[PDB]
RNA sequence: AAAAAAA
RNA sequence: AAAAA
RNA sequence: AAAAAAAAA
RNA sequence: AAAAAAA
RNA sequence: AAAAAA
RNA sequence: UUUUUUUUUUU
RNA sequence: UUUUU
RNA sequence: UUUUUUUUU
RNA sequence: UUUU
RNA sequence: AAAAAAA
RNA sequence: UUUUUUU
RNA sequence: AAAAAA
RNA sequence: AAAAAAA
RNA sequence: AAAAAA
């Protein structure tokens, strides 16, 4: 073990259980385009792509969403970003907002989904609404692909 | 061995007794964020009515017990200057003459400052009242007020 | 024992004169040994295309590593060397490359301040630490900045 | 101990392998000239004189050298070893000199775990330099 | 341990140095005439055969010397070393003799910390005296 | 404590020294051209602006350097230091770069005790290289 | 006590400047002191005859012991400096000599290898450690080799 | 368990 | 001391 | 994981 | 124990 | 466990 | 790395 | 856990 | 400690 | 938490 | 080293 | 570390 | 117990 | 505890 | 509690 320098025999037993398409817990980074004064609905379909090795999945259980302002804010302003979680059983009305204390620095915020509200979502569904004075917002979402 | 049980999967029955004491419109401790417009060299009185709003779920209240006030500069300062902000607490029994000032050591960084109201001065304030005066070289200031709505 | 040949080594660890070394048989020597190094050099990237970092950049007279023809890379760290495009924050991606098979990871770091560099690195496992000659590549660098700084921890042999 | 045969209560047919591996130290000689390096081939390890004519690959761990013949007149024996690798040859020259003219010169080097891959007969182990006409080599390897 | 690449959460750019120092033990030989001292030049340390040709100065810490060739007939090998300094040469003759005619003669001297300054190629390390025509040197020094 | 003068029962006359040594941390700036090294003169330490114009020699212990002006457009500030010695200049380029374009770049090097000798005004401390036109220096040294 | 004259002796054992020494009365001095030494020199012997080693060989500019006229010998060690005759192994004999009375011992060492030196020594007791001038002899050396190396441990005064 | 905050 | 995986 | 093989350098 | 994952 | 050394 | 209130099983 | 004195 | 044979949880 |  | 276990 | 049956 | 020295 | 004061 | 510094 860890000191061997050649191949060694494994005394395997019966054929085991198998699963060629298991689950995967991931953190998916991507960006969205946002306009001023309007809220953008983040689609779940942005997670199922070949760029994330997840084009083979058709459902996902989201756990937490984190957002950063990807582009600079308007002139004389500080960056901010808001998040309103969305659920098929009932959308929420929260506005988890974080503002940058430096014009040159991003504005970050996030929210964690409780265990009772951690069901599956499909590409047609939406995660949350994003609001910002910046034009582009980078998102990092922790979730469990299944 | 047999004593593992706090994860329920089905509905359980609640053996309730007499009718309890209820209150459909209780109090609420909050941290209300909002912004105000500020002019150069001119002090702006922050109205308490800014706290009662549907944008804060507080439009149903008519009075509030303010505990502490914090302020951040919301826009950039003038050219060559660092951001600053001042606060002067106001009270219906007698306004204060303190100017708690917090400046910015970085021109690109907000200027922050705040004050805490003592227990002896934590009374209700209606919308017509004012919380404090705000002075800043920036044209807009952001506030976060820890208050108890009732 | 015996008596003295006066080499005045005062208090052992504090002599001010040359002292005789009682040498013995000729030892094992190596005029060209190995050298574990952290080599700082810059590579240039275009906005939207990848750039393969040649291993030959490590061997140079600017690094004293000019007598080597092979090197074992341990870990690669990257920093954006130039400012990002307007309105944008800095970012840098690293995709490890190996002769036995290129990888597909994109270890990315993004600067939260437009004036600050974006940094990210990756460590090569022990089972993949073989030699790489000048004709080989280390990794693929992507960035919105025109130049990326690299500090490669490696062993020259 | 015993004096007669005993019964073994065997069970299922175990995992077998008619051609296993073998960790060895292979002693063989090479011819070296003055001022020129000799690339020791890995094919020298595979031979019927070492019970390794059935192996096609091997994993070298450490290499040791000894001057097999007397040095030139007025000189002391020395021997150099430059490790060679398919992913990239080295430039080290691990050298050992003899302090007595009538005594061998000994030197050796160890291959790290990260460089211990298989080498076929076409490959080379190391370059051997010596002022002596022959060098004795004892190579600790793992035949597979 | 790990079998794949792992991310390194790097931070700010660190302090770098592409041309660092190097502590070495340089082996080289010199020719020695009978009854004559040879001033070992410092420039012998700077060479592409030692990977040190990129340096221009070096801090010598200790010097060791062996006889590289056989002594004259009926004699035992000997070797002497006289430390040389730009601020003032010494007059010590650290001598070492062999107890077997077939064996080398070895001797050395350590430089005190107060006398460990830089030396350039034009400078000399020490004077060497021997009945043998060549002397093997191993100098522990600090390239900078 | 005491509120008035108190007598000092002095004895014999003591050993005096009107011109003693002084350990300092001298701050001064130098101009640096792009792509060119600047030999920092030792004489910059001897000045009435540092109270050290009464000295003629100084023992440098450590050297630290910051970028005093802003870098060129789109670049991050950097600074290099090459230690210089009369007994032999070095080839190290202790470089430090900034991670923020608006922030200085800092780097330094410590001189070993064996290389801590006196230097006069004509001598040079180190070579400095930077993309900025000025470099702020703080040199820990011993005036004597 | 009082206040300071600033001699910056950093951490006591690590000052980088000259520091004042508070000297007092003039001490006891000796411009020509003693010197305990181990003097290496060679003497030549013939096969079958003895050779008296003069004490004057110790005083020389080659040993820095040129200003001395007397010396106290403590111990004598000998080594054959040249090869032995053919078929023979090396041997060396030492017979101590003293002014108060020569001795008759023959402390002999023989080399078990024809290529190796033959070594032997003798220590002089404290009751016999007086001074010997250049006109005196140390010991008688016998050997089959033509030259014998001597390392004499002594005190020069 | 859920609402200021704190290095 | 009882149940239902 | 019995022997053969580098060594805690 | 290795890799992916939250402060 | 690199390269130097009471 | 340390709290005020809406309900809230259990020691 | 779930259902029972 | 490692490579192959045998023991024992 | 997913694997044999 | 021989019978019925070896936990 | 269980033990009990003829050389 | 030689010759130098917080 | 500060200053003046005896060995 | 001055001025320098793993
Ligand atoms: Cl011949
Ligand atoms: Cl069940
Ligand atoms: Mg950048
Ligand atoms: Mg002899």
From Swiss-Prot, chains D, E, F:
The keyword Calcium belongs to this UniProt entry's keyword annotation: no
Signal peptide region: none
InterPro entries named in the record: Satellite_virus_coat_sf
Subcellular location: Virion
GO cellular component: viral capsid
Entry GO MF terms: structural molecule activity
More about this protein: This virus depends on tobacco mosaic virus for its replication.
Protein name from the UniProt record: Coat protein
Keywords from the UniProt entry: Capsid protein, Virion
């Amino acid at each position: 073990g860890d000191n061997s320098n050649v191949v060694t025999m494994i005394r395997a037993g019966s054929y085991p259980k198998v699963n060629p398409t298991p689950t995967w817990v991931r953190a998916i980074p991507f960006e969205v385009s946002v306009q001023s004064g309007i809220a953008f609905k983040v689609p779940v379909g942005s997670l199922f792509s070949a760029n994330f090795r997840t084009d083979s999945f058709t459902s996902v259980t989201v756990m937490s969403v984190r957002a950063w302002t990807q582009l600079t804010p308007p002139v004389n302003e500080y960056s901010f970003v808001r998040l309103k979680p969305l659920f098929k059983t009932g959308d929420s009305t929260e506005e988890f907002e974080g503002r940058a204390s430096n014009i040159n620095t991003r504005a970050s915020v996030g929210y964690r989904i409780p265990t009772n509200l951690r069901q599956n979502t499909v590409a047609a569904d939406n995660v949350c609404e994003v609001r910002s004075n910046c034009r582009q917002v980078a998102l990092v979402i922790s979730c469990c692909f299944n």
